[PDB]
Structures are given as structure tokens and as C-alpha cells.
């Protein structure tokens, strides 16, 4: 799409309809006449277009009204209401841009943000843009959080976020225009290589893949149509369902064989009865021919009865010779009908040991994408965010993803090496108690109007807690934390002096030996300028490979690469890094997934703010004090950078509305 309607798309909004959020802020317009709504929608879309066409400079209300036409530029308060709305909710003027109006002389309100990951950073920038006092508390010695980027010399490789999953409607598209991200497209061709180290023939490759895609749809069918979602009170996982589907496909293979050989026995048994009839006829023909012979040996002249005998027996013999020939006709038809059925049998097996191994690679790929064993994923919901996927080619950041959090961090109060230990929230305000990560006895205290918590779900899951909430988080929040899944996937960075792989191949798979180890080093990436190969560890393997040294891990990495490219074409790696995201105390995993028993609604719960009880009993209902952003809070875009980014924008908007008030709702 292009023009004004393309701007609404690029902003994840329907161009010709008012969203629920807009209905809240403009209940006068959406409940009013259709004509006004279209004026509103155009104003919105046009303003979005203006910002999108040039995202490196702030878009003021003045600059907006200037470039509007009649009758849209007639109602200036409507334009102002719209512009403010779009600024507040971070649809316009988000990220990194030159400010036309320098920041207000004095700040209003004080917000402490836990974590300087992308979700944190995004919100911070917004809140500063709104004129609030903002300080971020980071436990690490760097910004970015799960956006981690290895650097040494010319080697640049992401140990965290790596792929921009299409620019169509992606807020990262706007960011990439503001930040020097070297975005390179990924060629989706992925040649596989079995355990021995030799390519899977395009015959098998395409037929196993097709079976995979078909097995997936089958589970979807099991979910929606057959309603197979609860088994023994426990919710059914994607893994369970795939197993059930495969079993029924092996069952069908056997059912087909049974009824095919069942056809053969019924025909072979028809032949059995016909041959019995034929043997019992060739027996009577044998006897009857003898009788006719003996009647003919009686030379004439003979009386009429003796003449009749010869004739009678002659008739009777040709009559029985008529039947036998009509039965030899039938025998010829049934005998070729059995050569028909025995010629083309049904399928021998559903999948062979060679087939099932290649199918496991496809499962490993799915286990990588969701950073989790398919036995943990919700059957019904694991793919609930498919509907909102971006359009366009997937891209990699060639100069490392860290360039983004770093760019966002510029001009912000960020306390590094500061581990939050306790969050205290009361009707009158909040205090955050943090320590210095180096000397843990040195204690810090932060007083604020509001706390934005961007702690990863793995962190929030810790038991005993790494961060204590005072008062404790309500049951509805903690249950959401327990229910939701927080997955794990790891990366092995291999730096060489020379390219020994296909330079036009971005990714190539390796097929494991067993189901158990399907995730282990199952995929390799060639994305960066320098000779770097990146190896993924997914599924059940990821968790186990963390208890294994880098030397042993790189050992298996070289082994696999030797088997594929030649045992003397694979040199020793100059630099090697292995991530351990589950072990990392500031992550405790990689990213969230919809666990079995969870839903997309849990993501909503995670985003819901906390309002403390009143200090004095009988005192009015307090302001909400504790807010949550982060990858695990955004239902429609979880487990992503853009999703995190967006959730930060979301909260900054909600917090400003709370503490600076909404002037645009009149």
C-alpha cells in the first residue's frame, strides 16, 4: 500500500476504521456522524504519512496544520487533538530525531525505570520528551539487555536479537532510518546435511518438508475442528498433538496394508473354490470319456439303445467340456486380477529412520523459533501472533544490533551496575532499593512517583525472588507469571580467517542423529561481512548444552563442519563465544512463548499496572504506581525487539496520561 492508507498500514492501523484506543480518546467522533469519522481518519493518516516520510526530525502541530488541506485544515482543535494523541502514544516522534522545540525548562514528575533493555530505553526517551524526570537502573555494565553484540577487531556477531522480521508495518523500519543499521536481506534457501555430512537429495528434502507443513495443519485441525485441547485435565501441547497425528498416519499406513492383503485373500479364495470345481469336473470328464470310449468300442451293427448310449455320452461330454472352458475363462480373469493387486501395493511405511530424522530438523527449527521444546507450547495458542506478522524480506543488522539500544541510550540518566533488589510502592509514592553489582553492600535508594518495571519474565519468575515487591504482587499478576512460558535458545559464534562455505548461502542445516538431540547445533548462519559462522542450539538441547564447556561445544561445531565441507577445509577458529541465556541472572532465559495452559490474554495481564492500597483507611482510591513494559507484555508482538520497543512506547504513553494528564480527550 501507498499514500495515506499506506501510512496507516505502516503504523499497524486500519486506514478506514477507528481503533478501540482512538474510540477511548475521541468518544465524541466515533459515536458521531460517519462524515466526521472520515475527516478524523484522514487527519490521522496524513499526519502519520508526514512523520513517516521524514522520521529524522520532530513533527510539530504547526508543521502538520501547515501541510493540511480544506476541509480538513478548518477545525484546528481536531488537528491538535489528533496530533497530540499520536505523539502521546508514540506513533509519531518516537526514537531518535532532532527536536524543533528544545526540552521544557523544568521537569514534571519522577519515574524510575528498571532495566535499560530496548523496552526500557524506548519508554525513557518518550517520558523525557514529555518533560518528566527519568532514571534507568541497569544491572549490566551495558545497555541493550537481550540485544547483545559480540565485537572484537572486525568480527561482529549478535548473541541476542539478530533478525528484523520484515519492514512492512515494523516500527524498526522507522528506527532504521534514524540509526545507521546496515540492513541486509536473508536468502531463505537452506540446504540440509545428514549425520554423515552429505546433502539431503531434493527428492527427500521437498517431500519431508511438505509432510512437516501438512503435519502442522493437521494439529490446527485437531485443535479447532476436533477440539482436542484437554487431555486428562492437562492442556494439550503442540508436541503431544504432533505425536498423536503421526501415530494416526502410521495407523493409516497399516490400515491400508491390512485391507489390501485382505483383497488378495478374498480373490485367492475365489480361485481356490474355482479350482476345486475344475478338479471335480476334470475328474468327471475323465470318467465320462472312458464310458463313451467303451460305448464306441461296441462295433455295429448295434440296436438303437446301444446307438443312443454313444450319442448320449457324446452330448454329455461336450456339455461338460463346455463348462470347463467357461471356468478356464474365469480362472484366467481371476489369475490376472491377482497379478494386478500384487503389482502395486500401498505404502510400506509412513516415514523411515532417514525420513524421521529430517522431520526432526524441521521440528528443531520450530523449537528454535519458539525457543522451547514443542511439548511446552500451547496447541491452541502457540501461533496466536501469526495474524500480525510483518510483510517483506527478513533482514539482519550487519553492523550488530547493539547499535540500536546504544543510539537510544544517548542523553539519558542510566545507572549501570545497579541491581534492583526491592520495589516499594505506596499511595504516596515509590522507593526502589538497588545495590552496586561490584560491591554488593553499597546500597542505593530511589524515590519516585512511578516505577516502570521491564524485568524479563525469567527474572520475574525467580524463586526465591531476585526482586522483592512491597507489598507483594497480587495473585492475578503472579499467576500470569507462572503460567506464561519463558524459553531458551543459544548461539555459538565461530570466527575464522577464511570463507570455506558457500558465500551465497546464508543458512544451512545439520540433521541430528536422534529426536533427543535435534536442536543441537542444527543450524548455521552466514550473515556478516567477516568470515563468521553462527551455530544455533535449540529445543531440549539448549538447556543441557549450558552445562558443557566452550571447548567441547566448538569441538562438535568443527566436527559437523568438517563432515560437510571437508576434514581439511575447516581451520581452527580464531575467536569463539558461546551464549548461556538461562544461566544469565539478568535474563534467566531467552524470550517468552505461549506455554500450554497459557493464552495471549496472559500477555495482557502482564501489561496491567498495579495500584497500591490507601495509606489512611477511608482515603480515596490511589493513582496506579507500578507499570510493566517488555517483550512479555505485548500480546500481538511478543518475543521480539519491535514488540519490546512498542510496549515501552505503550507505557510511556500511559504514564504520561496519568501524571501529566490528557489534554486531548476534550
Amino acid at each position: 500500500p501507498s499514500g495515506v492508507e499506506g501510512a496507516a498500514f505502516q503504523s499497524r492501523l486500519p486506514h478506514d476504521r477507528m481503533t478501540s484506543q482512538e474510540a477511548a480518546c475521541f468518544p465524541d467522533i466515533i459515536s458521531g456522524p460517519q462524515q466526521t469519522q472520515k475527516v478524523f481518519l484522514f487527519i490521522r493518516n496524513r499526519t502519520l504519512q508526514l512523520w513517516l516520510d521524514n522520521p529524522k526530525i520532530q513533527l510539530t502541530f504547526e508543521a502538520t496544520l501547515q501541510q493540511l488541506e480544506a476541509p480538513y485544515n478548518s477545525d484546528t482543535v481536531l488537528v491538535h487533538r489528533v496530533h497530540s494523541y499520536l505523539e502521546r502514544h508514540g506513533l509519531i516522534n518516537f526514537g531518535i530525531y532532532k527536536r524543533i522545540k528544545p526540552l521544557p525548562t523544568k521537569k514534571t514528575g519522577k519515574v524510575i525505570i528498571i532495566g535499560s533493555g530496548v523496552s526500557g530505553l524506548a519508554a525513557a526517551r518518550q517520558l523525557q520528551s514529555f518533560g518528566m524526570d527519568v532514571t534507568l537502573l541497569e544491572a549490566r555494565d551495558r545497555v541493550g539487555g537481550r540485544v547483545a553484540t559480540f565485537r572484537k577487531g572486525n568480527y561482529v556477531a549478535d548473541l541476542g536479537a539478530m533478525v528484523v522480521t520484515g519492514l512492512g508495518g515494523n516500527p524498526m523500519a522507522v528506527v532504521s532510518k534514524q540509526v545507521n543499521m546496515e540492513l541486509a536481506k536473508i536468502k531463505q534457501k537452506c540446504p540440509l546435511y545428514e549425520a554423515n555430512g552429505q546433502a539431503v537429495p531434493k527428492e527427500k528434502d521437498e517431500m519431508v518438508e511438505q509432510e512437516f507443513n501438512r503435519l502442522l495443519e493437521a494439529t490446527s485441525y485437531l485443535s479447532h475442528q476436533l477440539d482436542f485441547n484437554v487431555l486428562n485435565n492437562k492442556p494439550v501441547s503442540l508436541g503431544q498433538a504432533l505425536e498423536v497425528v503421526i501415530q494416526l498416519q502410521e495407523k493409516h499406513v497399516k490400515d491400508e496394508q491390512i485391507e489390501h492383503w485382505k483383497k488378495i485373500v478374498k480373490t485367492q479364495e475365489e480361485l481356490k473354490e474355482l479350482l476345486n470345481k475344475m478338479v471335480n469336473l476334470k475328474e468327471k470328464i475323465k470318467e465320462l470319456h472312458q464310458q463313451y470310449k467303451e460305448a464306441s468300442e461296441v462295433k455295429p451293427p448295434r440296436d438303437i439303445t446301444a446307438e443312443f448310449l454313444v450319442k448320449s455320452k457324446h452330448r454329455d461330454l461336450t456339455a461338460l467340456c463346455k463348462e470347463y472352458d467357461e471356468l478356464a475363462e474365469t480362472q484366467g480373469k481371476l489369475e490376472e486380477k491377482l497379478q494386478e493387486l500384487e503389482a502395486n501395493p500401498p505404502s510400506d511405511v509412513y516415514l523411515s529412520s532417514r525420513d524421521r530424522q529430517i522431520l526432526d530438523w524441521h521440528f528443531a527449527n520450530l523449537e528454535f523459533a519458539n525457543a522451547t521444546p514443542l511439548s511446552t507450547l500451547s496447541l491452541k495458542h502457540w501461533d496466536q501472533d501469526d495474524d500480525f506478522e510483518f510483510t517483506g524480506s527478513h533482514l539482519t543488522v550487519r553492523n550488530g544490533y547493539s547499535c540500536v539500544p546504544v543510539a537510544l541510550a544517548e542523553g539519558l540518566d542510566i545507572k549501570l551496575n545497579t541491581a534492583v533488589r526491592q520495589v516499594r510502592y505506596t499511595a504516596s509514592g515509590c522507593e526502589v532499593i538497588a545495590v552496586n553489582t561490584r560491591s554488593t553492600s553499597q546500597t542505593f535508594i530511589y524515590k519516585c512517583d512511578a516505577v516502570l518495571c521491564t524485568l524479563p519474565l525469567g527474572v520475574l519468575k525467580q524463586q526465591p525472588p531476585a526482586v522483592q515487591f512491597v507489598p507483594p504482587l497480587p495473585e492475578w499478576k503472579t499467576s500470569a507469571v507462572q503460567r506464561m512460558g519463558f524459553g531458551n535458545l543459544n548461539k555459538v559464534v565461530l570466527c575464522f580467517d577464511r570463507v570455506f562455505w558457500d558465500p551465497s548461502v546464508n543458512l544451512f542445516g545439520h540433521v541430528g542423529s536422534t529426536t533427543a538431540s535435534r536442536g543441537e547445533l542444527f543450524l548455521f548462519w552466514n550473515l556478516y561481512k567477516a568470515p563468521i559462522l553462527l551455530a544455533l542450539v535449540a529445543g531440549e538441547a539448549a538447556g543441557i548444552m549450558e552445562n558443557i564447556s566452550d571447548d567441547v561445544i566448538v569441538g562438535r561445531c568443527l566436527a559437523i563442519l568438517k563432515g560437510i565441507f571437508g576434514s581439511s577445509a575447516v581451520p581452527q577458529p580464531k575467536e569463539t563465544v558461546v551464549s548461556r541465556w538461562r544461566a544469565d541472572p539478568w535474563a534467566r532465559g531467552s524470550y517468552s512463548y505461549v506455554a500450554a495452559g497459557s493464552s495471549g490474554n496472559d500477555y495482557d495481564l502482564m501489561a496491567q499496572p498495579i495500584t497500591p492500597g490507601p495509606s489512611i483507611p477511608g482515603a480515596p482510591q490511589p493513582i496506579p504506581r507500578l507499570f510493566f513494559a517488555g517483550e512479555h507484555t505485548i500480546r500481538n508482538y511478543p518475543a521480539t525487539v519491535h514488540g519490546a520497543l512498542l510496549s515501552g512506547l505503550r507505557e510511556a504513553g500511559r504514564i504520561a496520561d496519568q501524571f501529566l494528564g490528557a489534554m486531548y480527550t476534550l
Binding site: 531463505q188 528454535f368 523459533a369 501469526d386 521480539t640
Partner: peptide, 6 residues
């Protein structure tokens, strides 16, 4: 998300 899949 399914989006990451190779």
C-alpha cells in the same frame, strides 16, 4: 514466535 523459523 513462528516468525523466526528458517
Amino acid at each position: 514466535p513462528r516468525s523466526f523459523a528458517a
